[PDB]
Design a protein around this nucleic acid. Sequence first.
DNA 1: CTGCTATAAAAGGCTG
DNA 2: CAGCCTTTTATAGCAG
Length: 179
Amino acid sequence: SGIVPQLQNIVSTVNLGCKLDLKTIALRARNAEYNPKRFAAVIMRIREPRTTALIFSSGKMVCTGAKSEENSRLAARKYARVVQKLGFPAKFLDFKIQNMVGSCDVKFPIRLEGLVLTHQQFSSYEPELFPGLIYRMIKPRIVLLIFVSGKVVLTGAKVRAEIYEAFENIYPILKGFRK
DNA sequence: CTGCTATAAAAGGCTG
DNA sequence: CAGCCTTTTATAGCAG
């Protein structure tokens, strides 16, 4: 297509390998908060890579907001180090990229009303509920949110190649419905 | 503007 | 048990 989807968000998980005292973490770490009555984890943030972590008493952690796999792992290690420095016997076990989000612009308006008819088996489009056509692709297994503006969001990927494969698969289809 | 509408994914505690 | 809740991010509609 000559168009490369840009990564906008990465969700990763890692296991610190030890029970954690969320109250202690919340009290001592800057940009760390804990309100068990609202959510069961410590919400911690760092400005670089700009991300947000959810740290559970179990030792498991969720890292969100990075723009790349590297940046996601880098952020996860920084959060792990913070917990480690606090005094907990933290490890860095089974780090894994769980979801990746990409977006691009095909630079032409799309006749979503048309796409939905021909690709009924993969599309959900109710403009009065949400303006984007939701395309549930099978191979690769990725969900695309296709807009009239020609903007496209792709999500559900574990590796970037899946975002690229999905976009390359949809491109010839969107061209067939230029508005 | 805010907070909804929809998408994926994980963590784990909570309600139904 | 299932499903909600929170967190992130592109996208773009809506009522207040």
